[PDB]
Amino acid sequence: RSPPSLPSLPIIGSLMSLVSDSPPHIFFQDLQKKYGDLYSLMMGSHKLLIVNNHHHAKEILIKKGKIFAGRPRTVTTDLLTRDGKDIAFADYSSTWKFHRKMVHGALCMFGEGSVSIEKIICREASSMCEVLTESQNSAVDLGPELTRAVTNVVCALCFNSSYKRGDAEFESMLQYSQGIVDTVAKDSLVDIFPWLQIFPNKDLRILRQCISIRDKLLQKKYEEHKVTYSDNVQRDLLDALLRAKRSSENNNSSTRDVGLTEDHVLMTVGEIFGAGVETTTTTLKWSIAYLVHNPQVQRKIQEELDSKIGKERHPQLSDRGNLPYLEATICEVMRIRPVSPLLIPHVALQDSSVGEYTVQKGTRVVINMWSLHHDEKEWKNPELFDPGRFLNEEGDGLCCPSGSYLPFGAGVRVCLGEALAKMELFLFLAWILQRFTLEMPTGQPLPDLQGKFGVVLQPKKFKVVAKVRA
Amino acid sequence: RSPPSLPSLPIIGSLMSLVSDSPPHIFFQDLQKKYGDLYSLMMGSHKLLIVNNHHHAKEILIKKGKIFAGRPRTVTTDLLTRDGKDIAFADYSSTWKFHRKMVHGALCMFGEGSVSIEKIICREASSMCEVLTESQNLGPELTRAVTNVVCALCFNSSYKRGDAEFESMLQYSQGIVDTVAKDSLVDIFPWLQIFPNKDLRILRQCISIRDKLLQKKYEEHKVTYSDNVQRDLLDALLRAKRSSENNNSSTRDVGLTEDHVLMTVGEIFGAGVETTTTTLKWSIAYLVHNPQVQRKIQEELDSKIGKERHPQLSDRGNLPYLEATICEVMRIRPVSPLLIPHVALQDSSVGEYTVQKGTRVVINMWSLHHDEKEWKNPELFDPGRFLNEEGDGLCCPSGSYLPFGAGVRVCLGEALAKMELFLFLAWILQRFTLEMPTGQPLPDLQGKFGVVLQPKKFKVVAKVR
Numbered sequence: 001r002s003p004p005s006l007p008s009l010p011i012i013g014s015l016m017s018l019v020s021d022s023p024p025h026i027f028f029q030d031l032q033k034k035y036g037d038l039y040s041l042m043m044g045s046h047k048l049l050i051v052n053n054h055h056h057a058k059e060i061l062i063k064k065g066k067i068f069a070g071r072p073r074t075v076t077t078d079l080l081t082r083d084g085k086d087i088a089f090a091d092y093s094s095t096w097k098f099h100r101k102m103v104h105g106a107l108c109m110f111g112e113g114s115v116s117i118e119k120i121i122c123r124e125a126s127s128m129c130e131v132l133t134e135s136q137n138s139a140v141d142l143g144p145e146l147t148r149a150v151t152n153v154v155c156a157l158c159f160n161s162s163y164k165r166g167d168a169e170f171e172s173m174l175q176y177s178q179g180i181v182d183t184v185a186k187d188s189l190v191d192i193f194p195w196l197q198i199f200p201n202k203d204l205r206i207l208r209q210c211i212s213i214r215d216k217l218l219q220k221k222y223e224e225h226k227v228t229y230s231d232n233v234q235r236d237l238l239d240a241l242l243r244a245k246r247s248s249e250n251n252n253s254s255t256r257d258v259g260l261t262e263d264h265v266l267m268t269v270g271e272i273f274g275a276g277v278e279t280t281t282t283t284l285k286w287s288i289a290y291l292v293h294n295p296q297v298q299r300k301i302q303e304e305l306d307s308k309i310g311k312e313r314h315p316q317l318s319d320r321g322n323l324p325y326l327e328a329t330i331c332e333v334m335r336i337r338p339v340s341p342l343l344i345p346h347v348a349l350q351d352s353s354v355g356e357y358t359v360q361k362g363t364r365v366v367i368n369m370w371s372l373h374h375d376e377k378e379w380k381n382p383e384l385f386d387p388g389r390f391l392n393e394e395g396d397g398l399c400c401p402s403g404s405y406l407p408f409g410a411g412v413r414v415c416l417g418e419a420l421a422k423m424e425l426f427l428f429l430a431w432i433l434q435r436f437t438l439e440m441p442t443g444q445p446l447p448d449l450q451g452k453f454g455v456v457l458q459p460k461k462f463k464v465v466a467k468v469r470a
Numbered sequence: 471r472s473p474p475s476l477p478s479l480p481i482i483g484s485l486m487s488l489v490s491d492s493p494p495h496i497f498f499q500d501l502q503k504k505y506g507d508l509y510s511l512m513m514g515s516h517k518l519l520i521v522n523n524h525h526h527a528k529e530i531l532i533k534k535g536k537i538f539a540g541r542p543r544t545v546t547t548d549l550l551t552r553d554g555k556d557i558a559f560a561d562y563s564s565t566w567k568f569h570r571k572m573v574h575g576a577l578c579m580f581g582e583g584s585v586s587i588e589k590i591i592c593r594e595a596s597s598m599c600e601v602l603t604e605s606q607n608l609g610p611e612l613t614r615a616v617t618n619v620v621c622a623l624c625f626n627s628s629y630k631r632g633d634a635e636f637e638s639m640l641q642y643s644q645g646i647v648d649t650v651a652k653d654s655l656v657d658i659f660p661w662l663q664i665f666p667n668k669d670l671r672i673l674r675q676c677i678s679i680r681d682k683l684l685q686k687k688y689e690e691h692k693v694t695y696s697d698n699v700q701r702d703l704l705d706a707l708l709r710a711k712r713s714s715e716n717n718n719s720s721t722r723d724v725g726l727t728e729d730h731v732l733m734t735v736g737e738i739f740g741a742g743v744e745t746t747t748t749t750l751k752w753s754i755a756y757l758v759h760n761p762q763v764q765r766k767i768q769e770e771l772d773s774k775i776g777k778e779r780h781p782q783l784s785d786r787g788n789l790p791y792l793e794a795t796i797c798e799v800m801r802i803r804p805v806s807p808l809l810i811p812h813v814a815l816q817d818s819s820v821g822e823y824t825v826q827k828g829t830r831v832v833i834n835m836w837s838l839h840h841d842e843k844e845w846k847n848p849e850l851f852d853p854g855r856f857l858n859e860e861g862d863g864l865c866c867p868s869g870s871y872l873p874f875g876a877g878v879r880v881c882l883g884e885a886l887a888k889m890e891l892f893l894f895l896a897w898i899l900q901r902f903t904l905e906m907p908t909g910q911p912l913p914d915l916q917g918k919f920g921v922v923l924q925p926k927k928f929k930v931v932a933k934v935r
């Protein structure tokens with residue numbers, strides 16, 4: 001009782017069956033017309049299970065979470081993460097669980113005396129909004145001005161620093177990062193046939209180059225932090241990891257079987273950094289896009305902000321319960337352009353089963369989040385940006401419209417930075433829309449909504465201007 | 471400009487206008503009939519503003535949260551909290567912000583390496599379900615299960631079944647709950663603490679028991695402390711206290727006195743016991759009154775967890791019916807029907823009416839959660855209020871729903887309460903059905919008003935399934 005499979009050849013597998021012009025997620029969606037909502041294929045030696053139904057997905061992620069909690073190893077992700085010593089791409093282990101806890105706790109604990117990431121997010125939203133007022137005349141494209149704000153929130157979190165406006169070594173970070181996003185967990189020949197390392201591989205060479213840069217900047221932050229370290233303060237996530245590593249070397253019963261080598265410390269912090277930039281910036285950019293496209297959504301948000309916050313005061317995180325239309329718009333942005341249309345593979349750790357079907361140990365289960373959030377059977381008009389999907393009868397609050405909505409995934413490997421991302425999206429969006437309304441420059445056209453595919457689904461460059469008032 | 475007001479005399483105020491056999495929350499809800507959804511009174515010298523409308527409540531707690539973030543000083547709470555060095559009754563200050571964050575962090579970080587508050591909740595759930603598999607022959611068993619969660623979180627210990635220290639703490643706690651933040655007369659008129667007042671004698675006594683037990687735990691922790699471990703919330707506060715003494719320049723405004731550390735840990739302990747136990751006891755009551763709800767939870771458990779493994783926290787999104795049931799329990803019997811006063815730190819306004827600096831704004835959580843304008847058949851227990859159309863997931867039925875409060879003074883242990891309620895109810899109902907001894911009637915739902923509306927004891931006996 002195995003699920004339908006694509007045709008397989010012996011070494012190759014099903015690769016001859018999966019050449020298309022569509023991006024991998026819509027391709028795997030359209031394949032449901034032939035193979036149903038749940039089906040397998042073979043990428044070289046490795047068996048893939050593609051999951052398009054949310055009942056199956058919640059069975060993978062929740063019911064049988066630890067079971068499908070394995071991560072696959074891959075040459076690109078092995079390099080990115082020093083052979084899986086991060087959190088995503090790290091195999092289900094007490095090491096993975098511990099590092100998740102440390103990131104969680106460092107976020108709860110950031111800012112020593114009353115100060116928190118709320119302060120940092122508000123500082124950076126403020127600094128940005130004051131550059132947008134000061135350049136309403138001279139257009140100035142937000143996006144990079146927004147990317148710096150987001151990067152600074154997570155930069156504060158991880159290394160207790162920030163990038164100056166117009167900083168040289170920031171744009172170098174953006175550049176190497178985009179290089180990594182280009183070349184990592186896109187299924188390429190070396191990721192399918194690892195022995196192709198014996199030949200020259202172009203994208204492996206540029207990936208390795210971007211990693212070298214990152215590794216330089218990480219080691220620089222690492223050794224600085226070590227010299228200036230004190231037990232009286234936990235400045236940032238890196239201090240909390242250094243404290244933990246110290247305890248590991250003092251032999252406490254706690255952290256004895258938990259990986260806290262130098263590698264682990266660096267990859268964890270590096271990971272949170274890269275995540276915090278590429279995920280939140282991407283999501284905000286989609287927000288910006290769908291707001292330019294749907295100015296009646298801009299206005300209804302602004303009218304809400306006028307009612308519950310506006311004038312005399314800027315939006316605070318205590319306002320979180322009280323701005324349901326803004327909340328719903330963010331839900332809808334996450335739903336319509338999922339940040340990862342194909343989730344990282346959930347590898348089967350033992351033999352198990354998914355809804356009537358058998359699932360062989362070691363199989364790579366790929367949840368098709370696109371198909372979950374765009375299924376016409378659970379979402380009406382799936383290409384329509386309607387924040388009302390997530391509102392209650394009156395607009396007093398939110399309703400889950402569908403069981404299929406898994407914006408931060410679920411279960412055991414649920415997004416580590418969910419709470420953070422919610423703070424950033426809420427605060428940045430509310431701060432901007434409080435004072436500004438977003439428009440397209442002169443009589444230019446509305447942005448293209450088809451996404452540059454990868455590990456993250458990112459939009460094509462907008463160039464969008466902010467004109468007061470709101 | 472000023473809101474309606476009950477008649478007040480000098481000195482006593484509106485007392486004696488407000489004599490009643492009604493519980494205070496209900497009494498104030500019915501006064502709406504004459505004064506409307508928002509009205510003031512005078513309790514002795516101090517001005518109360520009763521808020522019954524969710525729009526007004528949200529303006530108090532959210533839109534103007536920092537303005538109305540003051541707490542009143544009261545001779546009972548003062549004794550309970552060493553003159554406001556805890557969190558709940560601490561005045562709005564950087565100290566308050568800092569102790570909240572500390573508690574959040576210690577909760578996030580609990581018990582490094584192979585230990586999480588999930589595993590502790592699950593452990594105590596297992597202990598309780600082993601004892602309930604002495605089937606056909608509860609209450610105090612669930613109380614101790616709950617106590618062990620917050621006991622590990624705060625002190626890294628536990629009460630075994632039978633400990634004298636455990637019953638010892640339950641009785642001093644009850645004495646404290648029967649006396650604090652009730653309008654004693656000595657609270658209304660603080661000067662008559664120069665007389666024999668027997669409610670202060672019950673307090674002080676219950677408090678010296680408590681402080682003996684805190685200082686033992688504190689001195690034991692001090693003598694076993696290490697900088698490499700962090701065992702619990704108390705270690706966290708000791709670490710902060712040390713760094714503060716070493717002139718960490720950020721934790722300077724904040725107070726990390728011996729008193730601050732003791733009042734914070736003691737509060738989290740008290741809170742974790744009384745609030746979670748009360749809410750779980752109400753759950754049990756309503757489940758006994760509604761066994762078809764029990765059955766619908768049980769069939770959800772079977773078809774989304776199964777029978778070979780026990781409930782895990784990772785099932786958070788996957789049991790809508792049970793979570794909607796918990797919402798309705800929190801709705802129909804608020805843990806604090808009347809809430810601690812939100813004192814105005816400066817002159818302000820609440821929906822057109824003016825509000826005087828110093829006035830003590832009391833949110834009537836009962837009237838928010840039983841307003842016929844916003845809830846249909848408010849005394850009807852129905853978890854389907856919180857379900858969506860297809861029952862696939864949750865859905866907000868009213869903006870009047872504020873079970874953990876909102877804004878700046880929002881509940882500190884909300885995350886902890888949700889873990890506790892979710893796991894214990896799931897663990898229990900996966901293996902049992904709650905019936906009563908067949909020669910009994912369905913339990914009293916009226917309950918005892920104090921700082922935490924607690925139901926009256928009822929001797930339940932859960933059958934296996």
Ligand code: HEM
Binds near residue numbers: 415417421
């Ligand atoms: C802004 C919107 C975001 C969305 C919609 C989102 C969504 C998700 C999703 C769907 C997953 C996959 C879970 C799985 O494979 O089962 C995930 C994983 C992850 N997210 Fe996010 N995320 C976001 C932001 C962030 C941020 C800001 C961080 C910052 C650190 C972060 C850290 C992670 C990590 C570490 C994982 C891997 C967890 C693990 O393997 O245990 N995410 N996220």
Ligand code: HEM
Binds near residue numbers: 877880
């Ligand atoms: C089980 C159900 C619980 C409910 C329904 C509940 C509800 C509430 C409410 C309504 C408030 C007042 C919020 C406000 O004034 O805006 C509050 C405050 C508080 N709760 Fe809870 N609570 C629960 C459990 C807990 C637990 C387990 C703790 C454990 C530490 C806790 C600790 C607190 C504290 C410290 C405050 C005071 C916050 C402050 O003054 O800043 N609660 N809770």
Ligand SMILES: C[C@]12CC[C@H](O)CC1=CC[C@@H]1[C@@H]2CC[C@]2(C)C(c3cccnc3)=CC[C@@H]12
Binds near residue numbers: 339415
């Ligand atoms: C490659 C990149 C982004 C480019 C950075 O230079 C390196 C990096 C580190 C961790 C990656 C991240 C992209 C998003 C990833 C893949 C992911 C993620 C994806 C979606 C939501 N939340 C988290 C967790 C790890 C994250």
Ligand SMILES: C[C@]12CC[C@H](O)CC1=CC[C@@H]1[C@@H]2CC[C@]2(C)C(c3cccnc3)=CC[C@@H]12
Binds near residue numbers: 643650922
């Ligand atoms: C008096 C008592 C309960 C009796 C204990 O012996 C001492 C104690 C400590 C703090 C109090 C708590 C009852 C509930 C209180 C009043 C409160 C609370 C109330 C409702 C929801 N969440 C928290 C936080 C402080 C809590």
Ligand SMILES: [Cl-]
Binds near residue numbers: 327422
């Ligand atoms: Cl949200």
